Amino acid sequence: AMDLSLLKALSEADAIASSEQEVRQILLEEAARLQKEVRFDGLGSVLIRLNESTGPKVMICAHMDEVGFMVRSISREGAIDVLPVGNVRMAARQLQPVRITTREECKIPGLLDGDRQGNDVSAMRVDIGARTYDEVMQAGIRPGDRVTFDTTFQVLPHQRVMGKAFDDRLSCYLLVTLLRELHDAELPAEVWLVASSSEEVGLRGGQTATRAVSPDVAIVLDTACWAKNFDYGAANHRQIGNGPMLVLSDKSLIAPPKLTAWIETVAAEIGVPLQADMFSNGGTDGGAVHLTGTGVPTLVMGPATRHGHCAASIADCRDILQMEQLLSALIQRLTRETVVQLTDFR
């Protein structure tokens, strides 16, 4: 079963690096309802201790922030200059409905447009219909205000879903349903569920949250899409409906073969199909995470999406439920001896 109102709430929440209160508050409400202790790092990353165990520490990590824009400047004509926060697709920077969230938490709708030069779109502005600097000031808008795509979460035919911020609200969704499923479970590992701050602008909350937790093993949840959307050939290992992705490599991390092989054997036991994927361009917080302290065995997993870093992505509900199932099964098998065996280089 999908909780579509939770997925709607997370998708529609407006949260960028350093202003993630809308996502944080959802997570905090879930933890408080289940009487779970919440800790924070210096950046505001949410650290939820699932349980108490003398077994190995496992961190399951998602990012709270989405790609968007930030108010930079207001012109005398009431044009709102913005800069991108994260890698917003160049093709998603022209004539796009957006909304601006002010310090008083008011939301003002607008149309974003930019100048195109070849590949690149820069000099972006948001139009709220204002004719003066003062009209914008009156709406409560200020430099630093977050700007996000103006997308309503929607259900698609055949149990697929569409909305903004699936990178990485799908994984925030998974953190919550893991918490709901496993809050009273007897587990062989101590599990920390981490929603890290500010991933889209680099590798920020990932680093600090990992240090605060100090896991023995880490699972980073992120998503990705194939550039050629309707190419269902053997080269596309990011096809929605074909099961969770197991990321073998990205620019920041090459997954450890022992951990990869173990997860594959668990997925095969429980009947979850896996897509083994490699990122040619992208980075995840997998990179910063594994390089913490003296090194953490880490891999990246997640459901595939179509499109990404734009007004809307598409995901398949079965993929999401299967990731939930695989994560739970992995957690239930992560014994001290298992994690020792997966880190023995002799």
Annotated catalytic residues are: 199
Is 319 an interacting residue with respect to Zn ion (CB under 5 A)? no
Least Cβ distance, residue 96 to Zn ion (angstroms): 17
C-beta of 167 vs 190, nearer to Zn ion: 167
Which option in a copy of itself, Zn ion, none does residue 168 bind, with CB closer than 5 to 8 A by kind? Zn ion
Q: Which residues are annotated as a binding site for Zn(2+)?
A: 63, 167, 199-200, 222, 309
Q: Which residues are annotated as a binding site?
A: 63, 167, 199-200, 222, 309
C-beta of 122 vs 185, nearer to a copy of itself: 122
C-beta of 168 vs 190, nearer to Zn ion: 168
Q: Where are the beta strands (DSSP E) in the chain?
A: 38-40, 46-49, 57-63, 68-74, 80-85, 96-101, 107-117, 120-127, 146-149, 154-156, 160-163, 190-196, 217-221, 245-249, 275-278, 298-302, 313-316
Q: Which of 119, 98, 116 is nearest to 107 (CA)?
A: 98
**Among all chains, which residue has been given the structure tokens 């199932």?**
325
Which option in a copy of itself, Zn ion, none does residue 204 bind, with CB closer than 5 to 8 A by kind? a copy of itself
Between CA 169 and CA 164 the distance in angstroms is: 9
Applying the rule CB under 5 A, the residues between 124 and 183 that interact with Zn ion are 167-168
Angle at 277 between CA 305 and CA 225, to 5 degrees: 20
Task: List Cβ neighbours of 240 (8 Å cut-off, separation of 6 or more).
Answer: 160, 303, 304, 305, 306, 314, 315, 316, 319
| Segment lying near Zn ion (by CB under 5 A), choices 31-39, 114-122, 222-230, 267-275 | 222-230
Task: Kindly compute the dihedral angle of the four CA atoms of residues 218, 223, 228, 234, in this order, to the nearest 10 degrees.
Answer: 50
Fill in the per-residue mask, 179 to 218: x = in contact with Zn ion (CB under 5 A), - = not in contact.
----------------------------------------
Which option in Zn ion, a copy of itself, none does residue 167 bind, with CB closer than 5 to 8 A by kind? Zn ion
Is 277 an interacting residue with respect to Zn ion (CB under 5 A)? no
Which option in a copy of itself, Zn ion, none does residue 152 bind, with CB closer than 5 to 8 A by kind? a copy of itself
C-beta of 57 vs 309, nearer to Zn ion: 309
